[PDB]
Amino acid sequence: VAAVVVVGSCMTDLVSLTSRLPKTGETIHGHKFFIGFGGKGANQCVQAARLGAMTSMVCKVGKDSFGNDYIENLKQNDISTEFTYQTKDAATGTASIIVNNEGQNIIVIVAGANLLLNTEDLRAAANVISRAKVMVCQLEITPATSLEALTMARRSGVKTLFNPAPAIADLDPQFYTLSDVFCCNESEAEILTGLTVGSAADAGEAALVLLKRGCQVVIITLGAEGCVVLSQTEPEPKHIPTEKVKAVDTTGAGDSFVGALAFYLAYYPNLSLEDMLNRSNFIAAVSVQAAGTQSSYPYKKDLPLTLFLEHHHH
Amino acid sequence: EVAAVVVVGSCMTDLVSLTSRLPKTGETIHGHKFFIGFGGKGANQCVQAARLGAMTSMVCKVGKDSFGNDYIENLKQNDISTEFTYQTKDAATGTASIIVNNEGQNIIVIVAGANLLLNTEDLRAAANVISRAKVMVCQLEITPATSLEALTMARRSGVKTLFNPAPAIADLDPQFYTLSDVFCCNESEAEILTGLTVGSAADAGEAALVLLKRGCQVVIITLGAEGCVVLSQTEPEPKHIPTEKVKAVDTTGAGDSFVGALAFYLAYYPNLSLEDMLNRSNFIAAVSVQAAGTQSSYPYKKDLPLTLF
Numbered sequence: 001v002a003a004v005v006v007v008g009s010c011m012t013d014l015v016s017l018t019s020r021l022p023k024t025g026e027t028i029h030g031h032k033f034f035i036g037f038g039g040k041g042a043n044q045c046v047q048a049a050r051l052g053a054m055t056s057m058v059c060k061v062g063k064d065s066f067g068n069d070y071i072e073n074l075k076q077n078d079i080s081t082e083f084t085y086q087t088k089d090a091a092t093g094t095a096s097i098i099v100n101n102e103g104q105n106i107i108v109i110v111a112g113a114n115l116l117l118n119t120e121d122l123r124a125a126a127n128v129i130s131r132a133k134v135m136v137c138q139l140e141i142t143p144a145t146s147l148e149a150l151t152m153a154r155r156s157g158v159k160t161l162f163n164p165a166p167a168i169a170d171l172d173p174q175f176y177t178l179s180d181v182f183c184c185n186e187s188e189a190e191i192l193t194g195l196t197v198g199s200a201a202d203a204g205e206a207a208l209v210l211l212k213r214g215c216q217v218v219i220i221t222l223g224a225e226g227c228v229v230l231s232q233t234e235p236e237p238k239h240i241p242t243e244k245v246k247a248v249d250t251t252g253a254g255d256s257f258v259g260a261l262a263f264y265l266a267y268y269p270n271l272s273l274e275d276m277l278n279r280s281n282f283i284a285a286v287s288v289q290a291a292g293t294q295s296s297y298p299y300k301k302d303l304p305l306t307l308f309l310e311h312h313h314h
Numbered sequence: 315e316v317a318a319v320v321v322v323g324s325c326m327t328d329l330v331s332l333t334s335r336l337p338k339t340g341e342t343i344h345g346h347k348f349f350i351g352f353g354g355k356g357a358n359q360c361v362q363a364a365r366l367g368a369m370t371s372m373v374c375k376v377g378k379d380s381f382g383n384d385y386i387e388n389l390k391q392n393d394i395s396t397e398f399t400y401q402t403k404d405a406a407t408g409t410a411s412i413i414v415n416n417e418g419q420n421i422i423v424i425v426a427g428a429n430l431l432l433n434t435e436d437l438r439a440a441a442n443v444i445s446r447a448k449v450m451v452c453q454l455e456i457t458p459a460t461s462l463e464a465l466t467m468a469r470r471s472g473v474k475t476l477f478n479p480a481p482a483i484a485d486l487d488p489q490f491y492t493l494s495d496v497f498c499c500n501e502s503e504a505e506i507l508t509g510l511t512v513g514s515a516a517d518a519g520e521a522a523l524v525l526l527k528r529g530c531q532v533v534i535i536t537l538g539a540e541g542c543v544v545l546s547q548t549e550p551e552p553k554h555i556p557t558e559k560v561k562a563v564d565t566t567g568a569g570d571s572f573v574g575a576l577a578f579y580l581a582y583y584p585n586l587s588l589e590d591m592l593n594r595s596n597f598i599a600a601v602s603v604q605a606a607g608t609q610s611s612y613p614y615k616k617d618l619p620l621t622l623f
């Protein structure tokens with residue numbers, strides 16, 4: 001039985017390495033091309049699975065080479081692919097990425113088959129969603145399909161973890177009221193609230209705006225500075241810090257955090273928010289210490305034992 | 315079946331994202347469509363020649379990867395010999411990552427990859443097939459030493475060399491000119507090679523003369539919708555070959571259609587005048603611009619007017 005169900009996106013990463021980023025109208029040469037696996041939903045599902053969750057990825061890829069390769073990627077990470085759909089009507093979602101030697105990038109995402117994940121698909125997955133502990137979704141599929149997944153989860157008493165990423169300024173109000181845990185970064189919080197979010201203090205003002213729209217719990221991540229959390233029960237912002245590490249490549253850190261949080265909500269529901277967030281902050285900070293996105297996500301066996309205690313730890 | 319046209323050159327996977335806006339540094343943007351196509355100037359030329367009825371052989375190197383296996387299949391499906399289509403685990407298949415906005419402005423990143431690892435040992439295996447061909451076609455998308463050796467081998471056997479200096483670089487090895495029986499480029503490439511501005515047929519005549527004096531036998535500069543300009547050692551006065559106006563749907567790949575058509579006529583219609591070959595090639599490339607995509611747009615003999623054959 002899958003405890004963590006992720007309803008969301010898979011994207012093939014098409015990466016070119018160059019010495020400089022091209023501007024409009026330019027043709028340049030790069031020195032290396034490679035393919036990787038991305039998409040916020042799959043990234044989150046991968047981190048959760050690597051921590052030991054029984055996960056299932058509800059998603060749609062193309063009936064194409066990239067799609068077949070993505071299903072294999074899921075299987076290699078011990079993710080259930082019982083609800084990984086294919087479609088002849090769109091290509092697998094893509095992220096075309098150009099990266100320079102200092103790690104600055106240009107990215108073009110084409111959602112593709114992710115947008116064809118539909119009501120009929122969720123109805124077929126209705127039984128798996130209904131039986132989960134946590135349903136995770138983002139905004140890299142059709143927003144109406146994420147709303148439907150949240151609705152289905154709420155109707156079954158399944159905890160909803162909503163990551164409004166990438167953010168849209170005027171989200172349907174039901175996104176907030178159907179969210180048990182609403183988790184975003186500073187740039188997303190800016191789009192959602194119309195406030196500056198650079199610091200912890202700014203994040204607590206933004207978080208309260210989001211809380212009043214009907215979320216149970218709001219979490220705004222702060223990069224290397226950890227995160228801020230509020231809840232209906234505890235509306236005063238808490239700043240949960242992260243011990244400083246030497247970052248190698250911060251790509252994918254957000255999704256690591258969210259996947260770790262899903263793991264804790266499902267497997268350690270007893271734990272306070274503060275405890276879950278310290279742990280999740282730590283795991284994401286491990287990911288930044290290695291190259292790449294999914295490749296950087298740590299496994300349970302390579303992490304400290306204290307991350308897996310049933311009870312609160314100092 | 316003895317190949318009359320041998321192409322020693324590139325195969326590239328075209329990875330195309332269509333957007334409404336081109337990204338600036340640090341930005342993620344969302345586009346509306348992605349597609350994969352088979353490209354590379356060498357393969358594009360080979361495909362157009364094959365669709366006109368040429369017996370062709372593609373000498374190239376792709377990766378031991380999904381894109382490379384798919385490319386070999388693409389060549390076989392277009393009736394091209396893949397006897398000397400190699401695969402290597404040491405680089406990925408060449409890629410062109412192309413981002414195009416709705417006004418047709420683009421950002422392109424080329425990673426030549428496995429193309430660059432086609433080496434002289436790989437060529438030497440094709441010596442017999444090269445020796446028996448009528449035309450050898452090369453571009454500037456693989457490693458220069460390899461293309462130079464291909465041209466050299468062709469010359470040693472009396473095989474006509476058709477060289478396309480594309481993409482152009484300012485200070486090309488002089489042997490590219492002296493090994494070229496027919497040297498064919500566009501206006502932008504001629505500007506890079508000669509340092510001259512080319513914004514008219516007359517200007518292209520001046521640029522073509524520079525290329526001629528560097529040691530080419532025949533020089534052709536294509537002028538987009540305005541046809542082409544040709545001159546030769548035997549007839550150094552530029553001739554402008556115009557083309558009838560058509561409504562372009564997508565001009566991508568038109569140059570390679572032209573070069574592939576010219577290879578076909580050099581190989582199979584050697585007694586036509588150069589002017590006649592160029593009229594026909596201009597026409598075929600103008601058909602290609604009337605359909606979307608690169609290789610998908612290249613016409614077959616059966617769909618073309620009988621008078622071309």
Ligand SMILES: [K+]
Nearest residue numbers: 249287292296
């Ligand atoms: K990383």
Ligand SMILES: [K+]
Nearest residue numbers: 564602607611
């Ligand atoms: K075309």
